Amino acid sequence: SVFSERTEESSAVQYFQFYGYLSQQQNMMQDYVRTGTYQRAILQNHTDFKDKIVLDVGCGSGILSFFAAQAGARKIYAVEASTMAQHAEVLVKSNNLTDRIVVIPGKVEEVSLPEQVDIIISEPMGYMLFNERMLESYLHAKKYLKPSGNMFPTIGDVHLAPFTDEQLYMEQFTKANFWYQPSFHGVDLSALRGAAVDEYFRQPVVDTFDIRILMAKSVKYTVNFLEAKEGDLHRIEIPFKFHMLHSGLVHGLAFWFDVAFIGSIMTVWLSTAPTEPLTHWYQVRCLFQSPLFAKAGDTLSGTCLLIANKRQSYDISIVAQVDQTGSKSSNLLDLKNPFFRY
Amino acid sequence: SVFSERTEESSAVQYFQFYGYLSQQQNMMQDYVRTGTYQRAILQNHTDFKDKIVLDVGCGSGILSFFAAQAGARKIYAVEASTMAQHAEVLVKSNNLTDRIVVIPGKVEEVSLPEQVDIIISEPMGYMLFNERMLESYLHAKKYLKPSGNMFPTIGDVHLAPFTDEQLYMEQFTKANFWYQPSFHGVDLSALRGAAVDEYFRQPVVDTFDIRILMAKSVKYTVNFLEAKEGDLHRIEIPFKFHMLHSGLVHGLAFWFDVAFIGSIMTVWLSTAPTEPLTHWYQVRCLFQSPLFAKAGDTLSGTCLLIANKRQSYDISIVAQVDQTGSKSSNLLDLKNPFFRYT
Amino acid sequence: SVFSERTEESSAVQYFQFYGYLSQQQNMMQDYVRTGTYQRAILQNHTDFKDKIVLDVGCGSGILSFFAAQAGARKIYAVEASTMAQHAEVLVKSNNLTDRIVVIPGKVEEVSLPEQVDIIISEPMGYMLFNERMLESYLHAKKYLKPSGNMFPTIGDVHLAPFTDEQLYMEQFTKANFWYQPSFHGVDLSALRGAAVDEYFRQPVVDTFDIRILMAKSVKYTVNFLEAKEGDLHRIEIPFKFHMLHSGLVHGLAFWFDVAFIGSIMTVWLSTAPTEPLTHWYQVRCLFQSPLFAKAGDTLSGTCLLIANKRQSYDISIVAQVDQTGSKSSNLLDLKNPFFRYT
Amino acid sequence: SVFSERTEESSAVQYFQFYGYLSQQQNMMQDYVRTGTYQRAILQNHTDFKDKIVLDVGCGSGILSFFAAQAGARKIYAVEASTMAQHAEVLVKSNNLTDRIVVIPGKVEEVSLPEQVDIIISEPMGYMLFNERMLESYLHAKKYLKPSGNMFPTIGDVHLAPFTDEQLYMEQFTKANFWYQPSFHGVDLSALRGAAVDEYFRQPVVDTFDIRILMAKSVKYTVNFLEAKEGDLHRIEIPFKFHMLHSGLVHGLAFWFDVAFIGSIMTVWLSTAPTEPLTHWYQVRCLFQSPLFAKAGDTLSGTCLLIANKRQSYDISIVAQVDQTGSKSSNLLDLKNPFFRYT
Ligand SMILES: NC[C@H]1O[C@@H](n2cnc3c(N)ncnc32)[C@H](O)[C@@H]1O
Ligand SMILES: NC[C@H]1O[C@@H](n2cnc3c(N)ncnc32)[C@H](O)[C@@H]1O
Ligand SMILES: NC[C@H]1O[C@@H](n2cnc3c(N)ncnc32)[C@H](O)[C@@H]1O
Ligand SMILES: NC[C@H]1O[C@@H](n2cnc3c(N)ncnc32)[C@H](O)[C@@H]1O
């Protein structure tokens, strides 16, 4: 299947074992913003579901299937690759919905569905949206979608903005300074300081923050899931040009994302922006190894490049430059292994 | 190899990737208890190391090799399976020790050493001592040990004790009761309440605790690494009989361990007992599904059975009964995925 | 002369230029602790001055000579090498003391005095006591001292103790990190990162601090000016052994000093200890380039080595080691060019 | 050499020791105004640099040379007299520019250069522009300049303006009045009050100020470095006639400067005016001994005379007169030792 072609067995096993735990399902579900927003999107666009065939990709506990059933769907095919699939059917039976919700265990890239569907629903967003590479399974599932079909979510917006946070930068450097020691119990570790600094700064920082640290209006990169193809997500190049509102040191880039459910009756947005209520996604920040000084009015231009790897994630290379001075900074990040600071 | 037959590749890859991070080496190294005690054990027993051949199993950063070098070792073969090895060779060079420390990348079950060694050193202990199943690699390495060779650590003590902690026990039901509601956004989740409970009780709890929660003197099970074989660690049966010091409800068993370095000059102990300073191992507690009432003076008898799995960990089966009342309780735990509760 | 042989002309010119300013005399004089403490020492030991011949080395404005005159000295020879000598004579005249205070312009190593003296007074202390190397001029002056004569101050005590201050350390590391930039306006500065760190950490930090940052009771090094010779101050080796009271990171050593005026009537102390009221000397701290971790009970041993240079100051070499672990740290500091952190 | 004949060795030693510190290079480089403006001037006039020979006088770290290299210079001779030169060559190698940048240690008046150059670049400006007397080294370098060559900066403007700051003027007497007391610890200091006053008024004040204290449009004296000779800078006579915008007491003159880079493509200005963002040069103020009252519309006429001394600085003589009143005031200052008042 296309899934095994793009994934190390080691990672996939780990991935689906993680999602096999009810405690994780609980964590996801107790996010009122996430769960409530999904329900609002489905129910207020109920006409897009009424008496229709639905495909739910990565149903987990099955919550989204139930929303679709509440909206009046004729039949929901709920596909789930973890052992959660067995718990889902238990809920379907105890909620008397066996005539309407059909759980199909397996990967959407590997299962056979009885028929094409009118709409696909899913929650494929990870940290920075793209983490876990579930967006490609979501787009793969489009093979079962009718020409006149819809997708929930319909589009995705990545938001980038430069930030200043001296406290965060010093925190990571305080940790790396361990490896600068000339005599730790009589051992010289200093030969590895270079390696240590790189590794710590290779960590995306997951947490929330006050928006006053943002130094410029954010830049947006939009993905339309209805027209996009699987191949489009192997290499994502996000160019940016910021016009600085404040003078100071830029310590990195901040990331968050919006998704929109564009239904017939109305459009519902789900945002993880720092101006919005917190979600289990929080926000993501990537530190530069060396800060860049920029005056207000200067322009900070560069590229954020995401290249998919076989561990179900992306390698992030960020290059940034102050156009007036030529001061340039780089960083390479491993999105798979973040630093949770909350 | 002997390693690949007892480990799923999936688990092994994730395992060695974890140990390839300098941040992880740093966490271990900043444990003064662990690192300080090892140095003390080696340096205070310099006679066991001076002009000897040494094998360091899972050297990681190589810290233990350097200690052996400080103690006067003739040659140290440092074996490391993760990408930490490439970093180890760097430190050996920058510390001018290439003539004495030889880094050998690979798994100890798969590499070939040029010669037999006088002593083997290592830090193979995981949670509850046995977690990660590295102890089997440590014992495997004995194929390279000369007769009359020594091992650092030399012996291991697992300790079991019954405890009472009403809040820990009740916490598990507060969490699972999330699933006991008839309309979560219009959905009846109650059907999964049972499974949720089961899931939470299969998790060993990692954290520390006040020694006053202990209901009896601990029972210890000893592994002597000098006589032990790999096969001895696939099935570990720890029978126990506790004589209760306090009356109350027993909610589970607490585990910790000691290791001893037995050298010519002296014996050095490394303990993770709750009476001792805290380590990155902390302590481990396993809850019973149902608490047992025990009088002071009553006897709590039963068995703790550890069965190794191919995910580099153990399945724990605990059954206990109060002999005077016949009240019986059991539990099954998966040590591979504990609940880190410390705060 | 002995002064020109131990001093660069470039440094000497700037040095005596500095003390030629009335604004600097004012700063010294407005140190109530210093000036008041000196007056207490001289007047309360007035019997050591009554009808005696006095030599005041580096009188500056002449303030100590006036103290001596108040105490009843028959005659005071006041030696001053800067142009301040011209101002001193103005005060001597406007205060009608020409019969008792005689200003001698020149360096104490070069002037000729009519007679031997009973007591020498002076303020030869700089930062960390030894900076400015005036103590050698003070000791040189003993050639004019009678066999049974006295010296004010009589003895000096240097105190050193380890401290912890994460914020001070990161401040200096933050400053040096400028040179780690890979593209400053398109230029790679990283090649100088090493040189930058060295330069910044070579600076002793002058400021005050909370005594709670000290990690152990201080060690004392005493200089007795009555028996000491100049040659003793060219190389000062201060060994130390601290018994750690608290566990934590040691970021450096803190220095302060006491001097004592031991007269016939009583002993008066002048202290720049952080437990005492502040002076224009403040305290001095020397950072290690890399901190050392020590538990409470461990011992921190090492050496502070002071070597006098031709710029009228000292080069400081500090080596420290945690005896139990072997963790070692060093640093070289240039006392002549401090970092003033004071508010 | 031409440099040694106009400088006492004592000052020269101290001068080049100062610029040998990376900490000061950093201080200069972190001035965005200075460094940014220089880069703008060089890169936006790239046609003045592409494939030409450049001479960089007092390159320090070499930053300006790297800019010239970015603009496309074929070869840059970078001259540096301090020990910074060794650091410069290190950067040249690590930035892989050894084929184009040649670092020449030594004074520009003493070194040997192989060839004539197309353009000279440098940042020779001190406080009040002329301080440090490096502008004379900049002009000396024209012996290596081809006719029709260019100079970056090309011209320099010093700006003069009258100001009012009653608190600054009164501050000097508050400080000097320390000496006006009949019993400081029993000593009458009053005889030195006059000397103290004189000393404070000879110090030009370095800091910044609000432009609302300025009493008239500034008067400017221009130095065009392309036709100017070294000899033009030994005696600078700046006559001035201010037309007062405000009525009030004038306490002195404020100084700042502009330099312009006149290239083929465009002209770039670097200004230290108080209306502009602050720089590490700040502004300079020189007090009159007695304030002068001037009505708005009145004319304040006089002369500012700068006379070079052997301490690499200037003696400033200011004479001013209110033409309508005949009210006259003067002052003589030593720019070598300013008073840093900032914050
Ligand atoms: N939001 C995450 C949920 O979606 C499930 N999932 C991830 N990849 C999948 C896939 N390729 N096929 C079916 N379900 C998948 C995954 O098992 C988890 O339950
Ligand atoms: N202290 C933990 C260290 O021991 C290493 N390790 C575990 N099993 C190993 C094995 N079988 N061969 C070599 N190194 C091993 C493991 O890679 C880690 O670096
Ligand atoms: N305590 C410092 C004061 O004493 C003066 N001084 C420093 N070294 C001296 C010296 N070697 N001879 C005479 N006076 C000296 C120095 O000029 C200053 O005024
Ligand atoms: N911008 C300040 C830089 O200019 C250097 N400098 C001053 N006078 C010099 C001189 N005469 N020759 C070479 N470099 C000189 C001075 O050493 C410093 O590095």
The answer to whether C185 contacts D95, with C-beta atoms less than 8 Å apart, is no
Say which experimental method was used: X-ray
Per CB-CB distance under 8 Å, the chain A contacts of C183 are: 290, 326-329
- CATH architecture, domain defined by D1-153: 3-Layer(aba) Sandwich (3.40)
Q: Best mutation site among B2, B26, B38, B57 for ligand 2, i.e. most ligand atoms within 8 A of its Cβ?
A: B57
Tell me which residue of D194, D305, D264 sits closest to D44, measured CA to CA. Answer: D264
- Residue B69 and residue A255: Cα distance in Å, rounded? 48
Cα B166 from Cα C57, distance rounded (Å): 78
With helix as H, strand as E and coil as C, how does chain A read? CHHHHCCCHHHHHHHHHHCCCHHHHHHHHCCHHHHHHHHHHHHHCHHHCCCCEEEEECCCCCHHHHHHHHCCCCEEEEEECCCHHHHHHHHHHHCCCCCCEEEEECCCCCCCCCCCEEEEEECCCECCECHHHCHHHHHHHHHHEEEEEEEECCEEEEEEEEECCHHHHHHHHHHHHHHHCCCECCECCHHHHHHHHHHHHCCCEEECCCHHHECECCEEEEEECCCCCHHHHCEEEEEEEEEECCCEEEEEEEEEEEEEEECCCCEEEEECCCCCCCCCCCEEEEEEEEEEEECCCCEEEEEEEEEECCCCCEEEEEEEEECCCCCEEEEEEECCCCEECC
Strands ordered across the beta sheet of D53-57: D101-105, D75-80, D53-57, D117-122, D145-152
Residue C39's closest chain D neighbor by CA? D185
- 3 state SS of D71: coil
Q: What are the domain boundaries of chain D?
A: 1-153, 155-343
Ligand 2 pocket, residues with Cβ under 6 angstroms: B 3, 16, 19, 58, 60, 79-82, 84, 107-109, 123, 134, 137
* Closest approach of C196 to chain D, Cα-based (Å): 6
Query: Could you say which of 3.40.50.300, 2.70.160.11, 3.20.20.60, 3.30.499.10 is the CATH number of the domain covering A155-342?
Result: 2.70.160.11
Q: Find out whether C284 and C339 touch, Cβ atoms under 8 Å.
A: no
* Distance in Å, CA D102 to ligand 4 centroid: 16
| d(C-alpha B126, C-alpha B224), whole Å | 17
Separation CA C252–CA C201 (nearest Å): 11
CB pairs < 8 Å spanning B and C: 9
Residue identified by tokens 């900076």 is C131
Distances (CA, A) of A126 to A135, A257, A309, D342: 9, 10, 15, 52
Q: Chains D/B: 3 or more C-beta pairs closer than 8 A?
A: no
| Minimal CA separation from C136 to chain D, in Å | 23
Token pair 């030969």 is found at A191
As a whole number of angstroms, the longest Cα–Cα distance in chain D is 74
C-alpha–C-alpha distance, residues A246 and D153, integer Å:
30
Residue/partner pairs of C136-140 with CB below 8 Å, 24 or more apart: C136/C6, C136/C230, C136/C233, C136/C308, C137/C3, C137/C57, C137/C58, C137/C107, C137/C108, C137/C109, C138/C57, C138/C225, C139/C225, C139/C228, C139/C229, C139/C230, C139/C233, C140/C2, C140/C108, C140/C109, C140/C230
Peptide bond into A239 cis (omega under 30): no
Q: Which atom of ligand 2 is nearest to the CA of B107?
A: 12
* Cβ proximity of A292 and A138 under 8 Å: no
Q: Using a CB–CB cutoff of 8 Å, tell me whether A24 touches chain C.
A: no
C88 lines ligand 3 (CB under 6 A): no
Q: Which of C15, C16, C91 to mutate to test the pocket of ligand 3 (most atoms within 8 A of CB)?
A: C16
Q: Is C191 on the interface with D (CB under 8 A)?
A: yes
- CB contact under 8 Å between B39 and C293, yes or no, is no
Vertex D332, ends D330 and D334: CA angle to 5°?
155
Report the 10 Å Cβ neighbour count for D170.
Answer: 11
* Interatomic CA distance for residues B290 and D315, integer angstroms: 94
Q: Would you tell me how many other CB atoms lie within 10 Å of the CB of residue D27? A: 11
Residue C33 CA to residue C281 CA, distance in Å, equals 11
Whether ligand 3 lies within 6 angstroms of the CB of C205 is answered as no
Chains touching chain A through at least 3 C-beta pairs below 8 angstroms are: B, C, D
Backbone torsions φ then ψ of B226, nearest 5 degrees: -75, -30
Distance in angstroms (rounded) separating the CA atoms of residues A99 and C133: 97
Residue at token pair 């140290």: B76
Question: Which spans in chain D are helix H?
Answer: 9-18, 22-29, 32-43, 63-70, 84-94, 135-140, 166-176, 193-201
Distances (CA, A) of A72 to A39, A49, A52, C317: 13, 6, 8, 82
C31 is catalytic: yes
Which residue in A68, A81, A55, A64 sits closest to A141, CA to CA?
Answer: A55
Indicate which of C10, C27, C86, C313 best probes the interface with D, i.e. most D CBs within 10 Å of its own CB. C10
Residues A29 and A161: their CA atoms lie apart, in Å, by 29
Set of chain A residues whose Cβ sits within 8 Å of the Cβ of C166: 174
Whether D155 and D124 have beta carbons less than 8 Å apart is answered as no
- Rounded CA-CA distance D317/A216 in Å is 51
Contact across the interface for C325 and B39, Cβ inside 8 Å = yes
* Residue C182 preceded by cis peptide, ω within 30: no
Structure tokens at A202: 């290779």
- What are the residues whose beta carbons fall under 8 Å from the beta carbon of D147, sequence distance 6 or more? none
Q: How far is the CA of A204 from the centre of ligand 1 (A)?
A: 23
* Rounded Cα distance, D190 and D177, in Å: 8
Using an 8 Å CB-CB cutoff, list chain B residues near C295: 32, 36
Q: Which two tokens stand for residue C104?
A: 């001698």
For residue B58, the SS3 value is coil
Kindly state if the Cβ of C19 falls inside 6 Å of ligand 3.
Answer: yes
Question: Which ligand has its closest atom nearest to the C-alpha of B55?
Answer: 2
Q: Please state whether at least 3 CB pairs lie below 8 Å between chains C and B.
A: yes
Coil, strand or helix: which one is D287? strand
Enumerate residues 274 to 333 of chain A having a beta carbon within 8 A of any beta carbon in chain D.
293, 295, 324-326
CA distances from C223 to C123, C159, C249 (A): 15, 12, 31
Q: Which atom of ligand 2 is nearest to the CA of B134?
A: 8
Q: Which residues contact B170 (CB under 8 A, 6 or more apart)?
A: none
Strand order in the sheet with A314-322: A235-243, A299-308, A314-322, A328-334
CA–CA dist A155, A134 (Å, integer)? 14
Give the number of other CB atoms < 10 A from CB of residue B263. 20
Q: Do chains A and C touch, with touching meaning 3 or more CB–CB pairs less than 8 Å apart?
A: yes
Determine how many CB atoms are found less than 10 A away from the CB of residue D275: 8
Q: How many CB pairs under 8 A join A and B?
A: 96
The identity of residue A262, as a single letter, is I
- Is residue A215 within 8 A of residue A246, CB to CB? The reply is yes
**Quick check: CB of D137 below 6 Å from ligand 4?**
yes
Residues 6+ away with beta carbon under 8 Å from B171: none
Nearest to A50 by CA among A74, A29, A31, A33: A74
Q: Which residues contact C26 (CB under 8 A, 6 or more apart)?
A: D175, D178, D179, D196
Backbone angles phi, psi at A146, to 5 degrees: -65, 155
Q: Which two tokens stand for residue C62?
A: 């002449």
CB contact, 8 Å: A167 with chain C?
no
**Is residue D147 a contact partner of residue D116, using CB atoms and an 8 Å limit?**
no
- Residue D313 is given by DSSP the state S
Are the Cβ atoms of A36 and B200 closer than 8 angstroms? no
Sheet with D299-308, side-by-side order of all strands: D235-243, D299-308, D314-322, D328-334
* φ, ψ of residue D126 in degrees (nearest 5): -115, -170
Give domain C155-343's CATH architecture: Distorted Sandwich (2.70)
**Interval between CA C39 and ligand 4 midpoint (Å):** 48
Q: Which residues in chain B have their CB less than 8 angstroms from residue A200's CB?
A: 23
Chain centroid to Cα C131, Å, comes to 5
Cβ-Cβ contacts under 8 Å for B308 (sequence gap 6 or more): B6, B133, B233, B234, B235, B314
Kindly state whether A185 is in contact with chain C, defined as any CB-CB distance less than 8 angstroms.
Answer: yes
**C65 close to C39: Cβ distance less than 8 angstroms:** no
Position C44, amino acid: Q
Pairing, β B235-243 against β C299-308: unpaired
Which residue is it, tokens 């954020």? A304
CA distance D151 to D131: 20
d(CA B59, CA A187): 14
* Ligand 1: residue whose CA is nearest its atom 5: A58
Residue of D49, D223, D46, D64 lying closest to D139 (CA atoms) = D223
Active site residue A237: no
Pairing of strands D339-340, D205-207: parallel
Measured CA to CA, the distance from residue B63 to residue B78 in angstroms comes to 10
> Amino acid letter at C2?
V
